[PDB]
């Protein structure tokens, strides 16, 4: 539940996050928050990091995602926590 | 987009589509059309069938999905064709 205004907020991913995004075909330095969430969701699915039985569970201890988030696993239900982890890995343009 | 009313339709996927959906952890035999679209999108991402450069292009000639749709590839922009191709593999409850 990222607000409509926040969706279009322009951001510059830090090096680790940018590396993650480009690994699934992202090809610029500047993105909207919405685009970051698109590619990040895509990444997790492409790497099959979600538990098949309970698909809110993401494992990432041996993955680049774990390095940049700084956690071994997380639940997609933890909205606040994920936003916090994402915002730590980018700079909001003109902040 | 597929209209909201067309996505709330309760459907029963045919064997081949059902196999595809269950291959990415889908549990049930009946779904809303919305749920089918969630799991199918997930499937395509999970098997990395999208073209890296032009990510609307889905290559399925070496995948179960190509047998299911009967095409070597398709574009996600072709909303009507995808709707039609999906519906050939569903029966309405």
């Amino acid at each position: 539940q990222i607000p409509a205004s926040e969706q279009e907020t322009l951001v510059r991913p830090k090096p680790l996050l940018l590396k993650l995004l480009k690994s699934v075909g992202a090809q610029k330095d500047t993105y909207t928050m919405k685009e970051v969430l698109f590619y990040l969701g895509q990444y997790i699915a492409t790497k099959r990091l979600y538990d098949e039985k309970q698909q809110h569970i993401v494992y990432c201890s041996n993955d680049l995602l774990g390095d940049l988030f700084g956690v071994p696993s997380f639940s997609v239900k933890e909205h606040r926590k994920i936003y916090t982890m994402i915002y730590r890995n980018l700079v909001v343009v003109n902040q | 987009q597929i209209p909201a009313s067309e996505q709330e339709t309760l459907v029963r996927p045919k064997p081949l589509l059902l196999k595809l959906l269950k291959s990415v952890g889908a549990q049930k035999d009946t779904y809303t059309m919305k749920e089918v679209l969630f799991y199918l999108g997930q499937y395509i991402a999970t098997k990395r069938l999208y073209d890296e450069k032009q990510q609307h292009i889905v290559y399925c000639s070496n995948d179960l999905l190509g047998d299911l749709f009967g095409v070597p590839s398709f574009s996600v922009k072709e909303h009507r064709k995808i709707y039609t191709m999906i519906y050939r593999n569903l029966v309405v409850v």
Binding site: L37, F38, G41, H56, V76, I82 | A26, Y39, Q42
Partner: peptide
């Protein structure tokens, strides 16, 4: 629920 729906609800 699929991982695609959970992430969708997160977006």
């Amino acid at each position: 629920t699929s991982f695609x729906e959970y992430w969708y609800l997160l977006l």
